[PDB]
């Protein structure tokens, strides 16, 4: 059985992997908000010897950084933790190669996708037998398909929401809209509407509760690109999310959105996202 | 109140306070974020917790278990009874506040390796919590946003590398290597090179490669390979930690060149080992 380290909320322990288990709230299990590094350790003379282990702690120290994790462990302290890991598994390796895998992560709190003030890395080290690839595939060469770089749909990768979402806390803001080629795509956590002379536009799928809503209200509704530009001469602006609901956005990279003020669609489709949660209340009154 | 939360994992149920609930650390959750999540809100009236567009958002639930190849592990009355479950053992602490119920199902526990798992069985993590819907205030005043570009790093958010390992374990390949603006970008795990010419090439940002065509007197240039330059290529190679290097032989069923290993691959492979016996002469001498 391979033996495992992992640290969670400054506590940690060297266990049998059957043993090694995760809070549920670990942002690394909620949010994907974490990073790794492999380190190939090669058998050789009755020793596992580390390959590039200062190349591979750098890259580390480097994708920490990137996403605003402090390094937990200085290039000596994981170097030590590798050798432990490593130690700790030799039977299990024997005379055969290894790769120890790496990982660390923003650590649990409460869900919420900003940065939380006061949360410890989590760090899990581990060791598995390596198997390279064989003479006959080297020989031979492999087989591999092409396809395109791939969002649709609410996963749990989403370090990049993360990192928008942490962009507006960091500019004391409620949400970051985000442009692509100049066009409005979303927010961190929320769909983009915008309303021009009556009229409320969504970027291409849209929502079914929020034209549902338009619909009630006499709102006519289009869903089409909605360029930066014209983001920055809306109307109103407004975020909604299961969460928000609906609310106005009124301040856009710190400029007013038309007066400054909540606008009319803005009233009407508020006091329809209400009456939808009435009905609701009075279907469920009904059967009770 | 200690929040109730419901954990499902390897086809063993549980109902137990959140300090005691954890997954094993091989959950596909926390290695490569390979799963989805909902969110049901469940607003207090008269007395009662009622969930808002639950057929609604169940059915967006299903079609994303589908989207990414996920048995989903109930029908829509089987989650409806988990949610009324998960909710009502939380009655005492949800008070007569709004609330939100977070489920999550991952693809589950096993061996690390990118492709799915055989008869993986789905992870499934719900949970309420208090909902505070946005004040009066910030009804009425708005709220402040920002605008920043729509987006380098080894992260564990890796649901997109999974689904492009799975890709090619679906069509018995090694590997997809991927095209954008059909220009070559990466493998699902890996690192792609190709040689036309007896020169070198890679998309625009390994130093170890970099290093070992330096060794080897071989020109390397960093540069955007477009899709028929790849399809033409002398020869392709992936690179990885763990797989060191490799030579491509067959794109798509249509064999690169000759469709055997090159010359290029022969002198990077052949350095790529004297670098290791170089880092264990170094171990043995300290040693």
């Given at each position: 059985?391979?033996?495992?380290?992992?640290?969670?909320?400054?506590?940690?322990e060297?266990?049998?992997?059957?043993?090694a288990?995760?809070?549920?709230?670990?942002?690394?299990?909620?949010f994907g908000?974490?990073?790794?590094?492999?380190?190939?350790?090669?058998?050789?003379?009755?020793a596992?010897?580390?390959?590039?282990?200062?190349?591979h702690?750098?890259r580390?120290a480097?994708?920490?950084?990137?996403?605003?994790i402090?390094?937990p462990?200085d290039?000596?302290?994981w170097?030590?933790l590798?050798?432990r890991?490593?130690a700790?598994?030799?039977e299990?390796?024997?005379?055969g190669?290894a790769?120890?895998?790496?990982?660390?992560?923003?650590?649990?709190?409460?869900?919420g996708h900003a940065?939380?003030?006061?949360?410890?890395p989590?760090?899990?080290?581990?060791?598995?037998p390596?198997?390279?690839?064989?003479?006959?595939?080297?020989?031979?060469?492999?087989?591999?398909?092409?396809?395109e770089?791939?969002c649709?749909?609410?996963?749990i990768?989403?370090?990049?929401?993360?990192?928008?979402?942490?962009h507006?806390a960091?500019?004391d803001?409620?949400?970051?809209?985000?442009?692509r080629?100049?066009?409005?795509?979303?927010?961190?956590?929320?769909?983009?509407?915008?309303?021009?002379?009556g009229?409320?536009?969504?970027?291409?799928?849209?929502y079914?509760?929020?034209?549902?809503l338009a619909?009630?209200?006499?709102?006519?509704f289009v869903?089409?690109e909605?360029?930066?530009?014209?983001?920055?001469?809306?109307?109103?602006?407004?975020?909604?999310?299961?969460?928000?609901?609906?609310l106005?956005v009124?301040?856009?990279?710190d400029?007013?959105?038309?007066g400054?003020?909540?606008?009319?669609?803005?009233?009407?489709?508020?006091?329809?996202?209400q009456?939808?949660?009435?009905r609701?209340?009075?279907?469920?009154?009904?059967?009770?």
């Open positions: 059985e391979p033996i495992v380290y992992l640290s969670v909320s400054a506590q940690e060297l266990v049998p992997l059957s043993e288990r995760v809070p549920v709230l670990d942002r690394g299990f909620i908000d974490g990073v790794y590094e492999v380190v190939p350790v090669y058998a050789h003379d009755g596992h010897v580390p390959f590039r282990i200062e190349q702690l750098d580390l480097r994708s920490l950084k990137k996403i605003g402090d390094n462990h290039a000596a302290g170097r030590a590798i050798e890991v490593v700790a598994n030799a299990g390796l024997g005379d190669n790769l120890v895998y790496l990982q660390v992560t923003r650590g649990v709190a409460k869900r940065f939380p003030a006061n949360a410890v989590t760090v899990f080290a581990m060791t598995s390596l198997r390279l690839p064989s003479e006959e595939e080297r020989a031979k060469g492999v087989r591999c398909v092409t396809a770089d791939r649709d749909i609410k996963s990768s989403l370090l990049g929401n993360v990192l928008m979402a942490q507006a960091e500019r803001a409620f949400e970051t809209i985000q442009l080629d100049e066009n409005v795509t979303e927010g961190s956590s929320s769909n983009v509407w915008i309303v021009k002379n009229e409320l536009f969504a970027p291409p799928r849209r079914a509760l929020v034209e549902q619909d009630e209200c006499g709102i006519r869903a089409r909605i360029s930066e530009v014209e983001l920055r001469s809306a109307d109103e602006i407004m975020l909604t999310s299961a969460t928000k609901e609906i106005p009124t301040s856009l990279d400029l007013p959105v038309q400054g003020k909540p606008g009319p669609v803005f009233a009407a489709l508020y006091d329809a996202y009456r939808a949660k009435a609701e209340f009075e279907q469920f009154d009904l059967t009770r």
